[PDB]
PDB file of C-alpha atoms and ligand atoms in Angstrom:
ATOM      1  CA  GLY T 166       0.000   0.000   0.000  1.00 42.23           C
ATOM      2  CA  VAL T 167       1.229   3.537  -0.832  1.00 42.05           C
ATOM      3  CA  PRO T 168       2.157   5.565   2.355  1.00 42.98           C
ATOM      4  CA  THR T 169      -0.103   8.476   3.387  1.00 44.97           C
ATOM      5  CA  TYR T 170       1.011  11.712   5.035  1.00 47.02           C
ATOM      6  CA  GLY T 171      -0.943  14.542   6.695  1.00 47.30           C
ATOM      7  CA  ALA T 172      -1.279  16.502   9.914  1.00 49.18           C
ATOM      8  CA  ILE T 173      -2.883  16.647  13.273  1.00 46.19           C
ATOM      9  CA  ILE T 174      -3.526  20.296  13.693  1.00 43.31           C
ATOM     10  CA  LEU T 175      -4.265  21.572  17.203  1.00 46.25           C
ATOM     11  CA  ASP T 176      -5.301  24.941  18.483  1.00 47.82           C
ATOM     12  CA  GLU T 177      -3.556  27.115  21.029  1.00 48.04           C
ATOM     13  CA  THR T 178      -5.205  25.505  24.016  1.00 47.37           C
ATOM     14  CA  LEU T 179      -4.227  22.021  22.894  1.00 48.15           C
ATOM     15  CA  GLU T 180      -7.890  20.977  23.591  1.00 45.99           C
ATOM     16  CA  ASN T 181      -9.078  20.856  19.951  1.00 47.61           C
ATOM     17  CA  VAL T 182      -8.013  19.127  16.761  1.00 49.14           C
ATOM     18  CA  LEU T 183      -8.974  19.923  13.149  1.00 50.68           C
ATOM     19  CA  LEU T 184     -10.802  17.151  11.266  1.00 49.13           C
ATOM     20  CA  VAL T 185     -12.137  17.067   7.744  1.00 49.99           C
ATOM     21  CA  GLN T 186     -15.175  15.286   6.368  1.00 49.30           C
ATOM     22  CA  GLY T 187     -15.058  13.713   2.912  1.00 50.34           C
ATOM     23  CA  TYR T 188     -17.636  11.944   0.738  1.00 50.13           C
ATOM     24  CA  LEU T 189     -18.709   8.392  -0.087  1.00 47.25           C
ATOM     25  CA  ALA T 190     -16.107   5.897   1.272  1.00 43.12           C
ATOM     26  CA  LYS T 191     -14.480   8.889   3.073  1.00 43.14           C
ATOM     27  CA  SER T 192     -17.841  10.163   4.315  1.00 44.54           C
ATOM     28  CA  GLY T 193     -16.879  10.468   8.040  1.00 44.30           C
ATOM     29  CA  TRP T 194     -14.407  12.643   9.848  1.00 42.81           C
ATOM     30  CA  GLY T 195     -10.681  12.154   9.711  1.00 45.10           C
ATOM     31  CA  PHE T 196      -7.311  13.876   9.839  1.00 43.80           C
ATOM     32  CA  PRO T 197      -6.278  15.624   6.622  1.00 48.28           C
ATOM     33  CA  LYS T 198      -3.913  13.260   4.759  1.00 50.30           C
ATOM     34  CA  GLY T 199      -3.317  11.584   1.424  1.00 52.74           C
ATOM     35  CA  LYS T 200      -1.126   9.436  -0.763  1.00 49.65           C
ATOM     36  CA  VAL T 201       2.531  10.222  -1.439  1.00 52.13           C
ATOM     37  CA  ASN T 202       3.457  10.984  -5.134  1.00 53.17           C
ATOM     38  CA  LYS T 203       6.583   9.411  -6.880  1.00 55.05           C
ATOM     39  CA  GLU T 204       9.887  10.763  -5.421  1.00 51.99           C
ATOM     40  CA  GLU T 205       7.929  13.256  -3.092  1.00 49.04           C
ATOM     41  CA  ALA T 206       9.400  13.694   0.420  1.00 48.61           C
ATOM     42  CA  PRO T 207       7.155  12.895   3.426  1.00 49.18           C
ATOM     43  CA  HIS T 208       7.062  16.537   4.747  1.00 45.59           C
ATOM     44  CA  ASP T 209       6.123  17.813   1.305  1.00 45.93           C
ATOM     45  CA  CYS T 210       3.319  15.264   0.829  1.00 49.03           C
ATOM     46  CA  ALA T 211       1.887  16.255   4.289  1.00 47.67           C
ATOM     47  CA  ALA T 212       1.939  19.973   3.398  1.00 43.90           C
ATOM     48  CA  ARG T 213       0.384  19.395  -0.016  1.00 45.93           C
ATOM     49  CA  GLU T 214      -2.423  17.134   1.211  1.00 45.92           C
ATOM     50  CA  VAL T 215      -3.138  19.420   4.129  1.00 45.05           C
ATOM     51  CA  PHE T 216      -3.144  22.490   1.916  1.00 42.36           C
ATOM     52  CA  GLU T 217      -5.411  20.735  -0.683  1.00 42.39           C
ATOM     53  CA  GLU T 218      -7.879  19.663   2.033  1.00 42.34           C
ATOM     54  CA  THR T 219      -7.890  22.677   4.448  1.00 41.99           C
ATOM     55  CA  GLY T 220      -6.355  25.615   2.619  1.00 39.53           C
ATOM     56  CA  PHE T 221      -3.831  25.998   5.442  1.00 40.25           C
ATOM     57  CA  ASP T 222      -0.125  25.803   4.763  1.00 38.12           C
ATOM     58  CA  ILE T 223       1.797  23.899   7.377  1.00 36.54           C
ATOM     59  CA  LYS T 224       5.164  23.958   5.711  1.00 37.09           C
ATOM     60  CA  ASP T 225       6.739  26.564   8.064  1.00 37.34           C
ATOM     61  CA  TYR T 226       5.389  24.637  11.133  1.00 42.34           C
ATOM     62  CA  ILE T 227       6.325  21.049  10.517  1.00 38.71           C
ATOM     63  CA  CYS T 228       8.766  19.572  12.952  1.00 41.25           C
ATOM     64  CA  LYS T 229      10.575  16.546  11.572  1.00 44.02           C
ATOM     65  CA  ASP T 230      10.432  14.385  14.646  1.00 46.24           C
ATOM     66  CA  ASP T 231       6.922  15.330  15.765  1.00 44.00           C
ATOM     67  CA  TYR T 232       4.459  12.925  14.218  1.00 40.54           C
ATOM     68  CA  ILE T 233       2.328   9.849  14.896  1.00 42.26           C
ATOM     69  CA  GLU T 234       2.703   6.959  12.547  1.00 40.19           C
ATOM     70  CA  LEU T 235       0.539   3.882  12.240  1.00 35.46           C
ATOM     71  CA  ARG T 236       0.503   0.864  10.031  1.00 36.74           C
ATOM     72  CA  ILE T 237      -2.988  -0.220   9.308  1.00 36.59           C
ATOM     73  CA  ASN T 238      -3.490  -3.281   7.049  1.00 34.76           C
ATOM     74  CA  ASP T 239      -0.080  -2.979   5.771  1.00 35.54           C
ATOM     75  CA  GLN T 240      -0.371   0.747   4.794  1.00 36.95           C
ATOM     76  CA  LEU T 241       1.683   3.319   6.646  1.00 36.60           C
ATOM     77  CA  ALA T 242       0.005   6.661   7.751  1.00 33.04           C
ATOM     78  CA  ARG T 243       2.107   9.421   9.249  1.00 33.26           C
ATOM     79  CA  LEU T 244       0.537  12.613  10.698  1.00 31.98           C
ATOM     80  CA  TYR T 245       2.762  15.439  11.669  1.00 33.01           C
ATOM     81  CA  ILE T 246       1.715  17.159  14.846  1.00 30.75           C
ATOM     82  CA  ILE T 247       1.086  20.897  14.396  1.00 35.31           C
ATOM     83  CA  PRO T 248       0.033  22.737  17.622  1.00 35.57           C
ATOM     84  CA  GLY T 249      -0.850  26.210  18.273  1.00 35.35           C
ATOM     85  CA  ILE T 250      -2.958  27.052  15.263  1.00 35.14           C
ATOM     86  CA  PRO T 251      -5.575  29.732  16.165  1.00 38.60           C
ATOM     87  CA  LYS T 252      -9.128  28.528  16.240  1.00 39.70           C
ATOM     88  CA  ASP T 253     -10.182  31.556  14.194  1.00 39.96           C
ATOM     89  CA  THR T 254      -8.095  30.435  11.188  1.00 41.92           C
ATOM     90  CA  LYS T 255     -10.112  30.390   7.939  1.00 41.94           C
ATOM     91  CA  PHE T 256      -9.868  26.959   6.416  1.00 42.58           C
ATOM     92  CA  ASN T 257     -11.171  26.279   2.912  1.00 42.48           C
ATOM     93  CA  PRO T 258     -10.536  23.202   0.791  1.00 41.89           C
ATOM     94  CA  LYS T 259      -9.399  23.575  -2.791  1.00 40.86           C
ATOM     95  CA  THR T 260     -12.654  21.967  -4.075  1.00 41.82           C
ATOM     96  CA  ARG T 261     -15.867  20.989  -2.367  1.00 41.51           C
ATOM     97  CA  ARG T 262     -15.737  17.929  -4.666  1.00 44.00           C
ATOM     98  CA  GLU T 263     -13.571  16.065  -2.070  1.00 41.32           C
ATOM     99  CA  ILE T 264     -14.196  17.864   1.271  1.00 41.89           C
ATOM    100  CA  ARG T 265     -17.656  18.395   2.705  1.00 43.58           C
ATOM    101  CA  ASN T 266     -16.713  20.222   5.872  1.00 43.14           C
ATOM    102  CA  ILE T 267     -13.800  21.098   8.160  1.00 42.29           C
ATOM    103  CA  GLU T 268     -14.283  21.439  11.935  1.00 41.94           C
ATOM    104  CA  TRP T 269     -12.590  21.684  15.277  1.00 41.37           C
ATOM    105  CA  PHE T 270     -13.322  18.817  17.702  1.00 41.54           C
ATOM    106  CA  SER T 271     -12.613  18.554  21.378  1.00 42.73           C
ATOM    107  CA  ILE T 272      -9.949  15.923  21.842  1.00 45.03           C
ATOM    108  CA  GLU T 273     -11.279  14.742  25.132  1.00 45.04           C
ATOM    109  CA  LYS T 274     -14.734  14.106  23.619  1.00 44.84           C
ATOM    110  CA  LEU T 275     -13.505  12.119  20.581  1.00 43.69           C
ATOM    111  CA  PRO T 276     -13.736   8.352  20.901  1.00 43.61           C
ATOM    112  CA  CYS T 277     -10.509   6.362  21.077  1.00 41.93           C
ATOM    113  CA  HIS T 278     -12.238   3.054  20.115  1.00 44.45           C
ATOM    114  CA  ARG T 279     -15.486   1.984  18.498  1.00 45.54           C
ATOM    115  CA  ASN T 280     -18.202   0.323  20.589  1.00 46.61           C
ATOM    116  CA  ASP T 281     -18.944  -3.323  20.196  1.00 45.94           C
ATOM    117  CA  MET T 282     -22.549  -4.690  20.033  1.00 45.79           C
ATOM    118  CA  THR T 283     -22.394  -6.936  23.163  1.00 43.43           C
ATOM    119  CA  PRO T 284     -25.876  -5.486  23.993  1.00 42.15           C
ATOM    120  CA  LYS T 285     -27.174  -7.402  20.920  1.00 41.60           C
ATOM    121  CA  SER T 286     -24.887 -10.599  21.223  1.00 40.26           C
ATOM    122  CA  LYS T 287     -23.630  -9.681  17.745  1.00 38.60           C
ATOM    123  CA  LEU T 288     -19.939  -9.641  16.668  1.00 38.64           C
ATOM    124  CA  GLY T 289     -18.183  -6.578  15.324  1.00 38.45           C
ATOM    125  CA  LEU T 290     -18.276  -2.848  15.954  1.00 40.66           C
ATOM    126  CA  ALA T 291     -20.975  -0.186  15.706  1.00 41.87           C
ATOM    127  CA  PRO T 292     -20.548   2.460  13.010  1.00 43.31           C
ATOM    128  CA  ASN T 293     -18.846   5.641  14.163  1.00 45.67           C
ATOM    129  CA  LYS T 294     -18.374   8.752  12.081  1.00 44.95           C
ATOM    130  CA  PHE T 295     -14.900   9.222  13.509  1.00 45.70           C
ATOM    131  CA  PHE T 296     -13.666   5.760  12.381  1.00 46.95           C
ATOM    132  CA  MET T 297     -10.774   7.253  10.282  1.00 49.02           C
ATOM    133  CA  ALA T 298      -9.569   9.387  13.217  1.00 50.03           C
ATOM    134  CA  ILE T 299      -9.999   6.860  15.992  1.00 48.40           C
ATOM    135  CA  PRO T 300      -6.739   4.847  15.597  1.00 46.32           C
ATOM    136  CA  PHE T 301      -4.737   8.098  16.191  1.00 45.71           C
ATOM    137  CA  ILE T 302      -6.572   9.381  19.280  1.00 43.66           C
ATOM    138  CA  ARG T 303      -4.979   7.398  22.069  1.00 46.42           C
ATOM    139  CA  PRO T 304      -1.454   7.755  20.611  1.00 43.68           C
ATOM    140  CA  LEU T 305      -2.118  11.515  20.285  1.00 41.55           C
ATOM    141  CA  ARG T 306      -3.251  11.835  23.887  1.00 43.30           C
ATOM    142  CA  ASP T 307      -0.125   9.930  24.974  1.00 45.80           C
ATOM    143  CA  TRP T 308       2.163  11.999  22.792  1.00 47.50           C
ATOM    144  CA  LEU T 309       0.660  15.262  24.185  1.00 50.87           C
ATOM    145  CA  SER T 310       1.176  14.037  27.798  1.00 53.54           C
ATOM    146  CA  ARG T 311       4.805  13.191  27.128  1.00 54.36           C
ATOM    147  CA  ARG T 312       5.696  16.379  25.122  1.00 56.58           C
ATOM    148  CA  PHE T 313       3.680  18.960  27.201  1.00 57.13           C
ATOM    149  CA  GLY T 314       2.188  17.485  30.418  1.00 57.90           C
TER     150      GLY T 314
HETATM  151  C1  LJJ G 486      -9.163   6.507   4.170  1.00 56.52           C
HETATM  152  C2  LJJ G 486      -8.882   7.624   5.090  1.00 56.52           C
HETATM  153  N1  LJJ G 486      -8.555   7.609   6.331  1.00 56.52           N
HETATM  154  N2  LJJ G 486      -8.417   8.942   6.747  1.00 56.52           N
HETATM  155  C3  LJJ G 486      -8.672   9.681   5.708  1.00 56.52           C
HETATM  156  N3  LJJ G 486      -8.652  11.082   5.638  1.00 56.52           N
HETATM  157  C4  LJJ G 486      -9.620  11.840   4.836  1.00 56.52           C
HETATM  158  C5  LJJ G 486     -10.746  12.330   5.745  1.00 56.52           C
HETATM  159  C6  LJJ G 486     -11.970  12.848   5.024  1.00 56.52           C
HETATM  160  C7  LJJ G 486     -11.709  13.860   3.933  1.00 56.52           C
HETATM  161  C8  LJJ G 486     -11.034  13.304   2.708  1.00 56.52           C
HETATM  162  C9  LJJ G 486      -9.528  13.354   2.762  1.00 56.52           C
HETATM  163  C10 LJJ G 486      -8.895  12.956   4.086  1.00 56.52           C
HETATM  164  O1  LJJ G 486      -8.973   8.902   4.631  1.00 56.52           O
END
């Protein structure tokens, strides 16, 4: 699978994170990210995908060692951590053809797992609109505790 790169953008309080909402298969909320092009460096892919999806340029804010990386079904996803972005920043995707909406969410209110269906004696997980974000939430919380306190 082709690696994806993007960002976890936080506000000044460190309470809130910026998620984007796509369409169709990407219909829920997730961190802005996308597939690396041929010969493109990771930091440049992250800036491009984030700029294409939010209209915000992270290039001057990326720190090389500050990211969360996960391997999900043998595809690697790396999100650079970008704190301190004012909550009154105007975000606008390049085209509403890929991005429905862009919103701040409270980190403490986001789920860090989906719910089973043990109530119904049925296997699997209930749908959750944050399914794309969820795998990064606990590692983010842990990373913020270590790097800030
Ligand atoms: C698959 C997958 N997992 N996370 C994402 N991120 C997208 C979120 C919704 C908006 C479209 C572009 C970024 O896609």
